[PDB]
Write an enzyme that holds these catalytic residues in place. Structure first.
Site, PDB file in Angstrom:
ATOM      1  N   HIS A  40      -2.251   1.452   6.808  1.00 27.24           N
ATOM      2  CA  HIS A  40      -2.731   1.321   5.441  1.00 27.24           C
ATOM      3  C   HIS A  40      -3.000   2.694   4.837  1.00 27.24           C
ATOM      4  O   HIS A  40      -3.350   3.647   5.538  1.00 27.24           O
ATOM      5  CB  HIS A  40      -3.992   0.457   5.400  1.00 27.24           C
ATOM      6  CG  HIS A  40      -4.327  -0.057   4.045  1.00 27.24           C
ATOM      7  ND1 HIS A  40      -3.563  -0.998   3.385  1.00 27.24           N
ATOM      8  CD2 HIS A  40      -5.324   0.287   3.195  1.00 27.24           C
ATOM      9  CE1 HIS A  40      -4.107  -1.240   2.202  1.00 27.24           C
ATOM     10  NE2 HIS A  40      -5.172  -0.473   2.064  1.00 27.24           N
ATOM     11  N   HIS A  84      -5.753   1.562  -4.106  1.00 29.05           N
ATOM     12  CA  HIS A  84      -4.798   1.085  -3.123  1.00 29.05           C
ATOM     13  C   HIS A  84      -4.311  -0.298  -3.526  1.00 29.05           C
ATOM     14  O   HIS A  84      -4.991  -1.033  -4.247  1.00 29.05           O
ATOM     15  CB  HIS A  84      -5.378   1.058  -1.690  1.00 29.05           C
ATOM     16  CG  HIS A  84      -6.625   0.237  -1.520  1.00 29.05           C
ATOM     17  ND1 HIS A  84      -7.027  -0.248  -0.294  1.00 29.05           N
ATOM     18  CD2 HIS A  84      -7.569  -0.162  -2.405  1.00 29.05           C
ATOM     19  CE1 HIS A  84      -8.161  -0.914  -0.431  1.00 29.05           C
ATOM     20  NE2 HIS A  84      -8.510  -0.877  -1.702  1.00 29.05           N
ATOM     21  N   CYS A 102       0.824  -1.205   0.000  1.00 30.45           N
ATOM     22  CA  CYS A 102       0.000   0.000   0.000  1.00 30.45           C
ATOM     23  C   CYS A 102       0.859   1.256   0.000  1.00 30.45           C
ATOM     24  O   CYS A 102       0.676   2.141  -0.841  1.00 30.45           O
ATOM     25  CB  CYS A 102      -1.004  -0.029   1.167  1.00 30.45           C
ATOM     26  SG  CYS A 102      -0.490  -0.597   2.854  1.00 30.45           S
TER      27      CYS A 102
END
Length: 260
Positions: free
Chosen positions: A220, A232, A165
């Protein structure tokens, strides 16, 4: 400042330690740089190359990168100036074959034209060093990640073909000569804070709390790409993918804008 172009090669792996001086404690690196990233080479000293990404400079082993040049043809006659400003050094016909030595010099490539060295307007050359279109660097960053849809998820990777990510974000902004750090929580603590999701724009990065039992933690991150979508690198499929911003069931920690 006269600079050349570096492309990280990290032979046999994907990363190289970076240090803040040319005589460092090798166990005390400030962070890493990664395979296929682009840098400006400032110089060499003590076995290290001095590199720059936007406003960030650091030192990496000379074996981890290669100095490169970029050939292209011109599409618009213009004058090769002695510095990125319209003393004349030469002239470039219709479509002359030239070689780029440096980029992003306040709107000016640094080139070699049949033996003459100097600075030429960016829009005069066919090659566009940002690769993508867009009204601002934010939209460019968004279009860069869109090119990576479908790429597989791999921990600690930042391209060209696999990502996690946070690596996706740093890869995208490195292609724009904009530096951000490598981990999601640090990325979410720098750049311009956007406190209001209605004001988000493509290229803005979004950090998230994905652990309900550690609700303040940040592991994240994704990038808004407009139209209520963000992209993402996600373990939900182990792929770079679209994600609906509004129905995403994990709270936002921050929205950060690294483009200007």
């Amino acid at each position: 400042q006269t600079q050349t172009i570096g492309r990280l090669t990290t032979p046999g792996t994907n990363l190289v330690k970076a240090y803040k001086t040319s005589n460092p404690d090798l166990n005390r690196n400030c962070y890493w740089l990664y395979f296929d990233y682009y840098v400006h080479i400032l110089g060499y000293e003590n076995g290290f190359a001095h590199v720059r990404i936007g406003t960030e400079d650091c030192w990496i082993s000379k074996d981890s990168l290669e100095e490169i040049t970029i050939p292209t043809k011109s599409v618009t006659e213009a004058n090769i100036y002695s510095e990125p400003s319209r003393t004349i050094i030469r002239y470039v016909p219709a479509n002359s074959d030239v070689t780029i030595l440096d980029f992003n010099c306040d709107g000016f490539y640094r080139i070699n034209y049949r033996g003459y060295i100097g600075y030429i307007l960016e829009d005069a050359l066919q090659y566009k060093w940002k690769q993508v279109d867009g009204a601002n660097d934010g939209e460019r960053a968004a279009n860069l990640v869109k090119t990576k849809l479908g790429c597989k998820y791999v921990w600690a990777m930042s391209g060209p073909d696999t990502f996690d990510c946070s690596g996706l974000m740093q890869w995208a902004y490195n292609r724009l000569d904009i530096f951000m750090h490598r981990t999601a929580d640090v990325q979410g603590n720098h750049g311009q804070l956007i406190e209001d999701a209605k004001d988000i724009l493509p290229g803005d990065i979004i950090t998230f709390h994905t652990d309900s039992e550690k609700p303040t933690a940040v592991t994240h991150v994704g990038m808004y790409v407009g139209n209520g979508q963000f992209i993402h690198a996600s373990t939900n499929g182990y792929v770079v993918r679209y994600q609906d911003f509004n129905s995403y069931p994990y709270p936002v920690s921050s929205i950060r804008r690294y483009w200007t």
